[PDB]
Amino acid sequence: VIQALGGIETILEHTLFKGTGFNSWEGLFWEKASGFEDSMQFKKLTHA
Amino acid sequence: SVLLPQLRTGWHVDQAIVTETKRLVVIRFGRKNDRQCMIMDELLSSIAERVRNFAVIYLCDIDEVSDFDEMYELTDPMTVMFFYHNKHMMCDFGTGNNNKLNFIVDDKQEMIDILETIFRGARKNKGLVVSPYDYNHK
Amino acid sequence: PSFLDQEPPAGYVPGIGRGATGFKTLELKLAQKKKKRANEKSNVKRQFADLKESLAAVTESEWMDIPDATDFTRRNKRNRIQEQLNRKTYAAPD
Amino acid sequence: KALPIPEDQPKKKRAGRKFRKYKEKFRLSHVRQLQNRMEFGKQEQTVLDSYGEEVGLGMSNTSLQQAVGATSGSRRSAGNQAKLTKVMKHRISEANQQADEFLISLGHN
Amino acid sequence: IRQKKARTILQHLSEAWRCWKANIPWDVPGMPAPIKKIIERYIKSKADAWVSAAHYNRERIKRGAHVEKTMVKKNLGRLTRLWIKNEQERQRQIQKNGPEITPEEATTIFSVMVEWLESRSFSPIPFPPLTYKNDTKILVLALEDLKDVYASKVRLNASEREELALIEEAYDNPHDTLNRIKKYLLTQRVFKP
RNA sequence: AUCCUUAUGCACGGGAAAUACGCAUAUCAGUGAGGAUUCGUCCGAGAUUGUGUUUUUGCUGGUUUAAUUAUAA
């Protein structure tokens, strides 16, 4: 799928990722949201 | 219904809206022979006590007192409106009319998340509350 | 809700009352075309009519003297046990 | 019973020693974070659930341990290790002894 | 007198409707007979409406004519309620009218097996000896299979962490837990709902 | 005179839990609360009901420059 989309760069051109202006992406990690979300669930929260 | 108190006068109206200090004000404008103005009357009938801390519910028939019709632009059988410290609370539902309310909410839990969410917003003074739920297609 | 008990009016129009903010002849023949227009032109209740009638014999003492209600399903107990037991969660050990 | 009031409160922050050990339960571990971090540009490690569905454990192994499939020993928190409720505890132990005397009645006979 | 009593009257409309949701026969003294009759007839009406409505929605959900949403949700409840009701019925009448086998039939059946096994030369299963080489080499298997609901989960709810506790203890002090088993087999005939 | 025992109280050191604990003019409850089984028996003190808190109780912790005033004219 990646290659058939024209290789990574041609994707990232679809992103903001140049905005963060890392030169190359090769050192980076994402942050799963599920972590943040859960880490906010152990608190005490109204259904809303 | 019996739980829900009602309004007989524009005087009742604006006194109420003024005279509830610390909590939201909820008012149904609808005509007893409407369908929804029964249904929604039920939905709110079941939430009355459970919210009574931070809000309060009142029923008003347009046919009783039609005064506000001109000024608040009342069409539809049933429009709920929310007032907190005399200000018209505005929570965009994505429905396309941010002011007031129209349609029927089919879940208690939802409805509570609304009355609450708006409330919490109105305690900060933000004019816009952003609904939890975009029901727009209605 | 004392002003539901009071319920006076005053001389005032509601709008300024709060300081509110918004955020025969032609009609005659019109009526002619109205009544003209329509000129060309429950079961439930019926059921219960017998019983609501047969209550005719019910003394107002029994109306006064009647139980009010109960809970047979124990809605409270089990309910509060649920909304108890779920109160918290935890983290799944490593 | 009426829902209390939506309004948030200023956080009381009291962190003892005791109170901390009582926290370590509810707050994500370290490892449990080294899951969450999804290495950019490169497919996760995932494993197969009971259901075979893949649970991504993203960074939970430093990339040196992916090449060797070294899994992890790293740190295992004994703080959040799950433990019985009070009641259940005595039903357990109780039943255990009871069954054990029944047994020993098969021990001597 | 009315209004005050009117409200409560509404209640027994509810507690009626629930107590039919529960099958409970719902008897109160001091409830004047005619009213109680009324309630009955009412519940019959709302009942039939509710049931027919549930099945009505259902098949639609199978076809997919737009069901809104809360119908998809509540439907499962307002339905399963029934399937329980049907079950409770079938078993009432399997008390009253007694088992449906009749012994004659049973004789053929049981015979069939017995002949089969003899023909098959088959020894029954021994109750596990208190020393059984596979005991450990078994428990682990069974214990893991109560484990793996969880192996994804980040957040154990309450009832869970209770289980996962047990699974770990028995998974720790086996000889004790085995003894607990063997007793349970040899005696326990009563169980929690 | 010395020691042990028992219970209770004040303590000191140390650990453990904070789905635990309360509270109640409630209601009952050795004049049986509740349970068990090998069906012969055995066990023998709280249960119910309502209610409140329960990621907590009190406290304490670290990051988003004063006024006064002096010349020879």
Instruction: Indicate which of C5, C16, C18 best probes the interface with B, i.e. most B CBs within 10 Å of its own CB.
Output: C18
- E122 Cβ partners below 8 Å, 6+ apart? none
Element (H, E) at B90: strand B90-92
Contact E60, E67 (CB under 8 A): yes
C-alpha triplet A11, A17, A18: angle, nearest 5°: 100
Nucleotide with smallest C1' distance to residue A42 CA: F55
Taking only Cα atoms into account, the Rg of chain B, rounded to an integer number of angstroms, comes to 14
Please give the C-alpha separations between residue E172 and each of D53, E103, E136, E149, E177, in angstroms, as whole numbers.
29, 49, 11, 19, 9
Min CA distance, C36 vs chain B (Å)? 26
Q: Count Cβ atoms below 10 Å from residue B10 Cβ, excluding itself.
A: 22
Whether E55 and E86 have beta carbons less than 8 Å apart is answered as no
Asked if the Cβ of residue D21 lies within 7 A of any atom of strand F, the reply is yes
Name the experimental technique: cryo-EM
Length of chain B: 138
Half-sphere exposure of E12 (CA within 13 A, CB side): 21
E68 inside 8 A of chain B by CB: yes
Nucleotides of chain F in contact with protein CB (under 7 A) are 17-21, 36-38, 48-52, 54-61
Taking residue B8's Cβ as centre, other Cβ atoms within 10 Å add up to 14
Question: Do strands B24-29 and B79-84 pair parallel, antiparallel, or not at all (unpaired)?
Answer: antiparallel
Which is nearest to B93 in space by CA: B45, B138, B127? B138
CA–CA gap between residue C51 and residue E12 (Å, rounded)? 17
Alpha-carbon gap, residue D30 to A39, rounded angstroms = 12
Q: Spell out the long-range contacts of C78-87 with Cβ–Cβ below 8 A and sequence spacing 24 or more.
A: C85/E158, C85/E159, C86/E157, C86/E158, C87/E158
Which residues of B are less than 8 Å from A46 in CB distance?
Answer: 113, 116
Instruction: Using a CB–CB cutoff of 8 Å, tell me whether D29 touches chain C.
Output: yes
Distance of C1' in F56 from CA in B23, Å: 28
Closest-CA residue of D relative to C88 is D26
How far is CA E31 from each of CA C32, C54, E17, E46, rounded to the nearest angstrom? 57, 15, 16, 21
HEC string for D46-86: EEECCCCCEEECCCCCCHHHHHCCCCCCCCCCCCCCCCCCH
| 3-state SS track over B63-75 | CCCCHHHHHHCCC
CA distance C7 to chain E (A): 20
Q: Tell me, in Å, the resolution of the deposited structure.
A: 3.9
Residue type for position D1: K
DSSP helix/strand/coil, E118: helix
**Residue B29, SS3 per DSSP:** strand
Report d(CA E13, CA E8) in Å as an integer. 9
Is residue C93 exposed (0-12), middle (13-18) or buried (19+ Cβ within 10 Å)? buried
Nearest CA in chain E to B138: E68
Q: Which of A43, E127, E80 is nearest to D23 (CA)?
A: A43
d(CA B59, CA B78): 10
CA–CA separation, E57 and E50 (whole Å): 11
- According to DSSP, residue D45 is labeled P
Beta-bridge partners for B88:
B83
Rg, chain D, Cα only: 23
- For residues E161 and D82, the answer to whether their CB atoms sit within 8 Å is yes
Helix (H) or strand (E) holding D87: helix D86-108
Q: Which residue is nearest to nucleotide F55 (CA to C1')?
A: A43
DSSP secondary structure letter of residue D44: P
Which single residue is written with the structure tokens 């014999």? C57
Instruction: Report which DSSP code applies to C55.
Output: G
Pairing of strands B87-88, B55-60: unpaired
- In sequence order, what are the residues at sequence separation of 6 or more whose Cβ sits closer than 8 angstroms to the Cβ of residue C12? B11
Nearest to B102 by CA among B13, B26, B28: B28
The answer to whether the CB of B79 falls within 8 A of the CB of B93 is no
Phi, psi for residue B38 in degrees, rounded to 5: -90, -60
Instruction: Pick the closest to residue D79 from D35, D12, D20, D4 (CA basis).
Output: D20
Burial grade of C32 (CB within 10 A; 0-12, 13-18, 19 or more): exposed
DSSP-assigned states of every residue in E80-109? HHHHHHHHHHHHHHHHHT--SS-HHHHHHH
Q: How many CB atoms lie within 10 A of CB C49?
A: 10
Q: Is B7 helix (H, G, I), strand (E, B) or coil?
A: coil
Domains of chain B by range and CATH?
1-138 (3.40.30.10)
Which ranges of chain E would DSSP assign to H, the alpha helix?
A: 2-21, 33-63, 70-96, 103-120, 134-147, 158-170, 174-186
Residue D10, CB, less than 7 Å from strand F? no
> Residue for token digits 């103005």?
B37
Q: Which two tokens stand for residue D80?
A: 């959040």
- Sorted by sequence, the CB contacts under 8 Å of residue E91 that are 6+ apart come out as none
Q: Is the CB of E158 under 7 A from strand F?
A: yes
